[PDB]
Design a protein that fits this description.
The complex is a heterodimer of chains A (about 15) and B (about 750).
Chain A (H helix, E strand, L loop, with lengths): L16
Chain B lengths: L15 E2 L9 H10 L4 H7 L5 E2 L36 E4 L5 E4 L14 H14 L9 H8 L8 H4 L3 H5 L13 H16 L1 H10 L1 H9 L5 H6 L9 H17 L3 H11 L7 H4 L4 H9 L10 H15 L5 H8 L10 H13 L24 H16 L16 E3 L1 H4 L1 H4 L13 H8 L4 E4 L3 E4 L11 E3 L9 E4 L3 E4 L3 E4 L5 E4 L2 E4 L5 E2 L1 H23 L10 E2 L5 H7 L1 H10 L2 H12 L5 E4 L7 H4 L15 E2 L4 E5 L11 H15 L16 H10 L11 H11 L5 H10 L1 H4 L1 H9 L3
Parallel strand pairs in B: 1-2, 2-4, 15-16, 16-18
Antiparallel strand pairs in B: 3-4, 5-8, 6-11, 7-10, 9-10, 11-14, 12-13, 17-18
Classes of the chains: A little secondary structure (about 15), B alpha/beta (about 750).
PDB class: toxin
Keywords: Lethal Toxin, Mek2, mapkk, Uncleaved substrate, Protease-substrate complex, toxin
Assembly: dimeric
Chain lengths: ~15, ~750
Amino acid sequence: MLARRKPVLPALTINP
Amino acid sequence: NKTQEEHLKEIMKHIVKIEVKGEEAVKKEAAEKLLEKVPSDVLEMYKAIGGKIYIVDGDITKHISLEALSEDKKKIKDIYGKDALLHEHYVYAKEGYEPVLVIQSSEDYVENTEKALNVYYEIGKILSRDILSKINQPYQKFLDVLNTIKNASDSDGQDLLFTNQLKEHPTDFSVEFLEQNSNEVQEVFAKAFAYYIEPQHRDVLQLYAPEAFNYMDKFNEQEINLSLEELKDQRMLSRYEKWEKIKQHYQHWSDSLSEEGRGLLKKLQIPIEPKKDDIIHSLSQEEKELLKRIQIDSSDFLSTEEKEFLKKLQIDIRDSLSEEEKELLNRIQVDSSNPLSEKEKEFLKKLKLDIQPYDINQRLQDTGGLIDSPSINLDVRKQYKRDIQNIDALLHQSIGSTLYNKIYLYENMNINNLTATLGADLVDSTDNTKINRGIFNEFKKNFKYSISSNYMIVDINERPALDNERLKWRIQLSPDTRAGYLENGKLILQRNIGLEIKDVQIIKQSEKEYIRIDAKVVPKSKIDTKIQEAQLNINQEWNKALGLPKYTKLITFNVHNRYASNIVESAYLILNEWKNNIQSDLIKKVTNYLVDGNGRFVFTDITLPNIAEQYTHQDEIYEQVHSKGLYVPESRSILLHGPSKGVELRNDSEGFIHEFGHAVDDYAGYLLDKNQSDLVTNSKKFIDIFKEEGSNLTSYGRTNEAEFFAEAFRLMHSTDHAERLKVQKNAPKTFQFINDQIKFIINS
């Protein structure tokens, strides 16, 4: 056991 | 290597039974010498199996040791193959319990070069069916050799050491062949050995036998050292001895410490999941109620493991007071037809963070050592730091003591930690025992030096690994490497260590096959060198073709975890595949826009929320992203994570070419403006292109006008004109816009 694997994804970046 | 290499290079004579003719002071001179030749270890690694070598005279089928007179077995097949019976011959190695050989006596062993091969032949067989078997004998290795020379150009090698059986047999030897044939290979293995050992025949071998030599070689002065040991691990009445000794030393260290100390030494050993309320009870009033109605499962951001811990971090709130706790739960699932929110993504994103395990080692192997990096929060950040700083100064015992010598530790892990993309097909998927040779090689190919950025804990004795843990590293630490002794039979050894992957065959451990990443430590110092010293040859060698100012920095490296020796060195194929399929005039032209704003092609093995070319130019931390592919305008460079397999990306190659295309959808955004930093994709003439045919090619085909293109163009390239042509047939309602802009950028 030494995983975790899905730290993140997009949106559209959202601000100016 | 002199000195004691004689004390322990003969003393093993504690198997030299000299029931020799009373006429004192000779034979030994012969015996000693006779045996001198045979490797040192491969002797002892017999003793520890019932050490005894009978050197008696004349009638030998008389000696006590030989009383099991298997008169039938008495028909001693000679190394060459000419029938012959005991009486006659002068040295039969009797097998079974307390195996033994009875070498005849005669000052004539130095000279005679035959009953010198035989005494070696046997003492080799007594090495292939016995000793070098209780481990698992010649597995895949000695197989190939044992065949590549069976079907080599000069049909001769065979002729030297085979038989109608092995020689005539159809194709080539295949694992399984080690079935009821082990009684044949073992011999061929012997003969091989039997030769290489004998002074004159090493020469005759060398030439007549291609690979037989090398294998049979290597394995006798550089590889033996192991077999002896991966055979000491077998027996156990020592398996402890070691354990004991290695403690002794490290013991005093373990004595004086502290709870605080022995404490985190645990905090490390095991993570400390988030909290239940503390976390939730730390949100806002507005945040709290928002957390309720969330359509939760919809975002590919929160992986199952934690997705659940969120639906749960929800019930601890809903489990409170009034009726809306019954009704909102219903009125909320009403308009549960609209995917998600834009003010809520964050509401969860900012959580996707804080709900993290805090393993001062899953966020160390996550930043090569960047314990200072802005991948996590502010205080968290400052803990590991505070911590990783303490444990460091904590493990300070050298090692190599007056007790133990060349000593190796171990560790098992899964190929899904090094290169998940190969992880998939590592194991057969049709025998869950047999490893898929195919993807095997692909693995090993470029694997020469690995570095573990984090704290290594290791099983101090081959421990049977699981079922997905398929790699068995036999790392060979070295005097000066620092570690700790963790009761359990496991050693934690410092940060920043180097490993020269010096061999990677495949073994058989209890009916199951395994990859053996057997290695040895070297200083990271000497490792980081081999990298940049390579980070160049790539650049230089590329700057040319690409067409840039000699001495630039396009492809930059960043590898700190176990698979650099392929993290970096891979690149070549990646890039090379980038050029190959696309049209020169293009990339050459655009690889410049990027460099025009000092951007890179960051090949990394850490994590994208750590790769510099993206975090300072980020914006806010609440956002991050990560994965194989990545594109960043703020620092127009490409980040490509080596390990992580991809969401419908067959390989690293096809993941880059895509990503880059994302940068193309950046060119137009400037090759069409003074200050409207846009993307050809962010256009009204394009939104349509998307809100019509924008969902036909694949899954990725959506979520962003852009990526429909990235993947679109990605597609137009395929190793096969097919997968691309599909884009033509499917929706030229874009397959034109691409090619249009392509032959639109090629000029300015």
